Amino acid sequence: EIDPFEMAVKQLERAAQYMDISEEALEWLKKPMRIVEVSVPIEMDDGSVKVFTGFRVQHNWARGPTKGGIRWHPAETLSTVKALATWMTWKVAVVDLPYGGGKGGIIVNPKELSEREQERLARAYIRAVYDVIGPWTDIPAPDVYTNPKIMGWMMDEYETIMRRKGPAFGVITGKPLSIGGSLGRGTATAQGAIFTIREAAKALGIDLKGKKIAVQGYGNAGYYTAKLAKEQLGMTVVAVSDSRGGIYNPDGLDPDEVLKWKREHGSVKDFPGATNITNEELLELEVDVLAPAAIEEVITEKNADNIKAKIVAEVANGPVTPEADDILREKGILQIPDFLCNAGGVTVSYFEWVQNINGYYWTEEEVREKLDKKMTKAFWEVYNTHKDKNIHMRDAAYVVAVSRVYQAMKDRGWVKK
Ligand SMILES: NC(=O)C1=CN([C@@H]2O[C@H](COP(=O)(O)OP(=O)(O)OC[C@H]3O[C@@H](n4cnc5c(N)ncnc54)[C@H](OP(=O)(O)O)[C@@H]3O)[C@@H](O)[C@H]2O)C=CC1
């Protein structure tokens, strides 16, 4: 049923087919450099002891310490962790961070655990994987069903074990502001998406002031993308959507009022002055920027032709299928690859790690400007590769990331060819 690691390896081979890479380097990149599977025992609230399965996969560390989150899902598998670590490698390589690829996970349903049990689980996971993590070895991060509270617990346990012999704040990112946290973490993904959209408009020669944007999904990423677009880029937000449905208004939407209505009516539907539309119908609107910030695979071969957006900002994690990719490219529409558009979160986590390591913490403006520089440089590199190699933007981003990792490997002497 299309194993995640098989899919990742196929993606890597496809990317290697568009660039000059040696066979030994490809074989090295097809396998994670270190996989750690540990037992995570905790004491239940009823006094019993339960053992959970924890993972920590470090795909590659040629460019520096590995970076990646920890998932707490009942359906976690070592294959999924390996695939996500492989993808995290390219995610940190495309935006030029001194990081490798890493990922963790515990096979547990956190909906049935109390606060004390969750804290015990985090501390036991740290005790189990201490020997393969560190400020300069492996930096975990929040992921699905994991939050900054668990980050604080993990950091505290790591500091307790390490005996405060170094920057224990920098061992993990996504921490609360009170303990080594960073500013701008809430709006990192949306800010990166906005910078990439601005650069794409600059590349296409389109002035965004007075244009239209449609956003699918109105969670944290979608709402902040719409709000930041309207604020900075001056783009008129004409359509937003949630799981229940979507709304449309050619005169424009106010993101704050829409958020208030969603937080009051439980959904964005039936917003005053707005016409109710379906998600599929939102994908059909004639806009200049489309930002899918929702479930995977919303653009398929069926509806790829009927898309009228000039720029498709893949804020979510792969909302466009390869057939849809080819169809959309044929229509002369610029796509911003998913792991380049939403690279703001990992970039801001890197900024947090830098602040923790240095012992000096920045402000909201400094973080915003550094993120702006990083996203602009990454998008311009990807677009230049796209224009030079006459390939898809996703293929160009993969080529850039794999080339950076391959050059780092060659410089270390790991591969001689
Ligand atoms: N936000 C972040 O920090 C980062 C985000 N990403 C990626 O970004 C996207 C969104 O992130 P995030 O804000 O955390 O997500 P959220 O869980 O906070 O919100 C999800 C939003 O998308 C909607 N949604 C879920 N399924 C559908 C669907 N089938 N159709 C239409 N709308 C749907 C939800 O609707 P409803 O409210 O009704 O449930 C909600 O509006 C994801 O694809 C994620 O992978 C990854 C990098 C970090």
Swiss-Prot record:
Q: What is its EC number?
A: 1.4.1.3
Q: Which reaction does it catalyse?
A: L-glutamate + NAD(+) + H2O = 2-oxoglutarate + NH4(+) + NADH + H(+); L-glutamate + NADP(+) + H2O = 2-oxoglutarate + NH4(+) + NADPH + H(+)
Gene3D superfamilies according to UniProt:
Leucine Dehydrogenase, chain A, domain 1, NAD(P)-binding Rossmann-like Domain
Q: Where in the sequence is the active site?
A: K103
Task: Write out the GO biological process terms.
Answer: glutamate catabolic process
User: Mind listing the GO molecular function terms for this protein?
Assistant: glutamate dehydrogenase (NAD+) activity; glutamate dehydrogenase (NADP+) activity
Root EC class:
oxidoreductase
**Which InterPro entries does the UniProt record give?**
Aminoacid_DH-like_N_sf, GLPV_dehydrogenases, Glu/Leu/Phe/Val/Trp_DH, Glu/Leu/Phe/Val/Trp_DH_C, Glu/Leu/Phe/Val/Trp_DH_dimer, Glu/Leu/Phe/Val_DH_AS, Glu_DH, NAD(P)-bd_dom_sf
> Which of this chain's residues are annotated to bind NAD(+)?
G217, Y218, G219, N220, A221, G222, Y223
Instruction: Alphabetically list the UniProt keywords.
Output: NAD, NADP, Oxidoreductase
What SMART domains would the database entry show? ELFV_dehydrog
Q: Which domain of life is it from?
A: Archaea
Relate the assembly described in the record. Answer: Homohexamer.
Write out the similarity annotation: Belongs to the Glu/Leu/Phe/Val dehydrogenases family.
Name of this chain's protein: Glutamate dehydrogenase
